[PDB]
């Protein structure tokens, strides 16, 4: 029985535009496998280009939004989760706003001044490669002033659990930092995600600072390798990274338990904490090739699945199984599609 607004999240509300991309698209825009890049000017043509293609799938995205709204979806109790993001005054943001409302996710969306449109992600799907080109758009306009509003900040004060992806470093770092400081101050549960390799590479200061406030840190193999290399962890990078992140001092220099979970695709995930001396591996659900529909958002679902159980008192191993289940459910679906709740289990 969790109170209303028990879980709070802020991030980038984005519209995923999923397309069966031709192979030349990856060479043309210099896109890499399973990677994500913020759109530069040289990428801008990709949005009108994929628009000329048939069978586009428009579906609400945003890493933080995916996770938080699935937690709300899993819990089934109305208004247990609340989300804050910046959309634009267009039909895309209206769709995202109604999508959240449809599953009882409380939202205080900031609206970017026209004509700044809501962010969009070009999800290029092919048999050989999957890659994302993200245009943040309105999501950048997410301000501290909006968060510091009385009616908006009240959602933060009532919350006992926070989830903020590393992606929000590029849009509103002062906001997520102010909340992280509040969380650690009131001994709350702060959950953070490494989100992408480029964040550890180009925003190393912000990532490490967030970790110092985080009680639970999520990451995958590529993010662990990128993080480890930047921190000079040359030998056994992935394991050394998990240990390093768990062992980092908190901001107030107090002794707390920070949980770290590194996912590794089909391979067993790793986990440990600041008290544990060992790094444990946890096996994952095995898939046949024709069973895998779309792995995009699997990591977002994993976090949702774990947190939803963990904050309800479920043991570590039990919560890990729920996390895999959430990810596996998304894998069998195209985009971050949350179907009827009755068909989950």
Ligand X SMILES: Nc1ncnc2c1ncn2[C@@H]1O[C@H](CO)[C@@H](O)[C@H]1O
Ligand Y SMILES: Nc1ncnc2c1ncn2[C@@H]1O[C@H](COP(=O)(O)O)[C@@H](O)[C@H]1O
Taking CB under 6 A as the rule, which mask of x and - marks residues 283-312 in contact with ligand X?
-------------xx-xx------------
Q: What is the DSSP string of 255-281?
A: ----EEEEEETTEEEEEEESS-SS-EE
Nearest CB to ligand X, comparing residues 272 and 296: 296
- Contacted by 18, from Cl ion, ligand Y, ligand X, none: CB < 5 to 8 Å by type: none
Shortest Cβ 319–ligand Y spacing (Å): 13
- Run of H or E residues at 129: none
What lies within 8 Å, CB to CB, of 215 at 6+ separation is 183, 189, 190, 191, 256, 257, 258, 259
Question: Does 16 contact ligand X by CB under 6 A?
Answer: yes
Residue in 38, 208, 265, 314 binding ligand Y, rule: CB under 6 A: 265
Residue in 28, 94, 264, 333 binding ligand Y, rule: CB under 6 A: 264
- Contacted by 85, from Cl ion, ligand Y, ligand X, none: CB < 5 to 8 Å by type: none
Nearest CB to ligand Y, comparing residues 264 and 280: 264
Could you say which of 141, 273, 300, 309 is catalytic?
300
Catalytic status, residue 300: yes
Question: Does 134 contact ligand X by CB under 6 A?
Answer: yes
Tokens, residue 109: 């969306």
Question: Does 59 contact ligand Y by CB under 6 A?
Answer: no
Q: Interaction with ligand Y in 311-330: which residues (CB under 6 A)? A: 324, 327
Q: How far apart are the first and last CA of the chain?
A: 20
Q: Are strands 14-20 and 118-125 parallel, antiparallel or unpaired?
A: parallel
Q: Which parts of the chain are beta strand (E)?
A: 7-11, 14-20, 35-38, 57-60, 81-88, 106-107, 110-112, 118-125, 130-137, 161-165, 189-193, 216-220, 259-264, 267-273, 280-282
Question: Does 287 contact ligand Y by CB under 6 A?
Answer: yes
- Identify whether the C-beta of residue 226 lies closer than 8 Å to the C-beta of residue 197: yes
Interface with Cl ion by CB under 5 A: which residues?
11-12, 62-64, 165, 167
* Residues forming the active site: 300
């Amino acid at each position: 029985d969790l109170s209303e607004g028990y879980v709070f999240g802020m991030g980038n509300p984005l519209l995923d535009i999923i397309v069966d991309a031709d192979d030349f698209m990856y060479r043309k825009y210099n896109l890499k496998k399973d990677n994500i890049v913020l759109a530069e000017e040289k990428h801008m043509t990709i949005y009108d280009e994929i628009q000329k293609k048939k069978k586009l799938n428009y579906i609400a995205g945003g890493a933080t939004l995916n996770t938080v709204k699935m937690i709300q979806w899993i819990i089934q109790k109305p208004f247990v989760c609340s989300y804050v993001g910046c959309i634009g005054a267009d039909i895309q943001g209206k769709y995202i706003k109604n999508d959240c409302s449809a599953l009882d996710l409380v939202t205080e969306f900031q609206i970017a001044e026209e004509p700044l449109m809501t962010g969009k992600v070009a999800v290029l799907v092919s048999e050989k490669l999957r890659s994302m080109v993200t245009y943040l758009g309105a999501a950048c306009d997410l301000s501290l002033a909006h968060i510091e509003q009385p009616h908006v900040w009240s959602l933060v004060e009532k919350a006992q659990v926070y989830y903020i992806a590393g992606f929000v470093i590029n849009t509103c770092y002062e906001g997520m930092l102010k909340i992280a400081k509040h969380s650690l101050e009131n001994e709350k549960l702060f959950c953070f995600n490494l989100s992408a390799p480029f964040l550890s590479q180009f925003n190393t200061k912000e990532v490490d600072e967030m970790i110092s406030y985080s009680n639970i840190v999520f990451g995958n193999e590529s993010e662990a390798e990128a993080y480890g290399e930047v921190h000079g962890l040359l030998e056994d990078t992935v394991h050394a990274t998990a240990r390093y992140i768990a062992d980092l001092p908190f901001a107030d220099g107090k002794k707390r338990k920070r949980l770290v979970i590194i996912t590794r695709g089909k391979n067993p995930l790793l986990y440990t904490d600041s008290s544990d001396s060992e790094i444990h591996q946890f096996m994952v659900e095995q898939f046949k090739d024709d069973q895998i529909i779309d792995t995009n958002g699997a990591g977002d679902a994993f976090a949702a699945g774990f947190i939803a159980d963990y904050i309800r008192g479920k043991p570590m191993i039990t919560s890990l199984h729920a996390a895999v289940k959430a990810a596996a459910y998304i894998i069998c679906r195209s985009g971050f599609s949350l179907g009827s709740r009755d068909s989950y289990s």
